[PDB]
A = this chain, B = another copy of it.
Amino acid sequence: MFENITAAPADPILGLADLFRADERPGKINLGQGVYKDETGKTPVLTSVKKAEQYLLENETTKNYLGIDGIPEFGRCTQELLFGKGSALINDKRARTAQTPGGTGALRVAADFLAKNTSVKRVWVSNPSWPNHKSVFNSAGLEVREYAYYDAENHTLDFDALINSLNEAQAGDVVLFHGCCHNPTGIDPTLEQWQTLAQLSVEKGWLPLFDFAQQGFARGLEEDAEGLRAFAAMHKELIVASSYSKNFGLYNERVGACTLVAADSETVDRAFSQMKAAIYANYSNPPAHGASVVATILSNDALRAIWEQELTDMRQRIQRMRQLFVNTLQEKGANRDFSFIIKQNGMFSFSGLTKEQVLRLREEFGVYAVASGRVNVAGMTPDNMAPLCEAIVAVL
């Protein structure tokens, strides 16, 4: 039965990691990953997380299954983060949240829910997006189409091209928006642009799907949710897939949420029953440890304060590295202006390096970026900045 199965293709991001591990040279610089790294180049467990895990070790008396939708406090804390305390969506009980195995799991649950229970056939994603979006939606039987996003000429949002692209989307199509810290470009809509998109989406009959992988990494928790909240003010229905992997440093514990919003409480509860059915037929119920850590932190004043400061420290270190990168390239004699990097948000930027320049950076200099030119700014440190920028200047 398995004799003639074709091997799955290499995969751009995970394949690069395989190459970095096989490479035994000494001065190597990894900008090709999707995790935060601190000034020492490590991805530590957050202190707030360790404190929460100690509390769980001391206090948990059972591992009995969670509900299909997971820990209730986790859902409540998630909705407050997304929509704001005192949001009409929360007051009117228009939103239901399922705890999921990561943001990826949330996207998969959303896709299965939509494929099985609605007329949705098509999801629009930005060009470029995280390559896993296509894989997730396709696995549910949904077609993926691209909308213009990235202005490759000046590394900004091509807003006119975006609008014109999305004219082809029909009423009842889903449109995926990265809520902040776009992956891979780090280019986000301004608030006014979000507001323009919110109005257009209502007019055109799109179902918005927001993906929040990095809430807190652009400007702050509340600011980063502005775009979502502009949509939420205008729409009867939307879905949010959110992740706590980066902002809690909980990658491998698989901590995410799928939040369903409908016009009223009766409708959302009915629809959510089918979202729960989609989860039941997938992994039954979600993993407790990471989500319990998040709920424990978010619901405790002391822990939440420690965590919010840790998140602020990550956001600020990335901002420092953006500035340092631009400054250092200038003083090492780079032949183009890199100031666009300062305007980009979160973990990722498109460097504007060509695929051949990135190949040369890996082969000649041991500097690892994704083939698209995506760099993880959190992979930069004061200690590796000079060699990194020297290598980049050399390939320009």
From B57, B101, B207, contact of A1 by CB (8 A)? B207
Q: Which of B116, B273, B286 contacts A7 (CB 8 A)?
A: B273
Chain B nearest Cβ from A132, distance in angstroms: 7
Q: Which B residues lie within 8 Å of A289 (CB)?
A: 253, 287, 289-290
Q: Are A276 and B64 within 8 A (Cβ)?
A: no
Q: Is A252 within 8 A of B2, CB to CB?
A: no
- Which of chain B's residues have a CB closer than 8 A to the CB of A263? 2-3
B252 pairs with A63, CB closer than 8 A: yes
CB distance from A221 to the nearest CB of B (A): 20
B251 touches A65 (CB 8 A): yes
In the bound assembly, the distance between CA atoms of A162 and B305 in angstroms comes to 61
Interface size class of A (residues with CB under 8 A): 35 or more
Question: Are the C-beta atoms of A281 and B138 separated by less than 8 Å?
Answer: yes
The answer to whether B65 and A118 have CB atoms under 8 Å apart is no
A182 to chain B: closest CB distance in Å? Answer: 19
B118 near A254 with CB under 8 A, answer no
Q: Which of B108, B139, B250 contacts A63 (CB 8 A)?
A: B250
Is the Cβ of B54 less than 8 Å from the Cβ of A57? yes
Interchain Cβ contacts under 8 Å between A and B, 20 examples: A2-B270, A5-B118, A5-B271, A43-B63, A44-B62, A45-B61, A45-B62, A65-B252, A66-B252, A101-B254, A101-B286, A104-B283, A105-B283, A116-B139, A138-B281, A139-B282, A252-B285, A253-B287, A253-B288, A283-B283
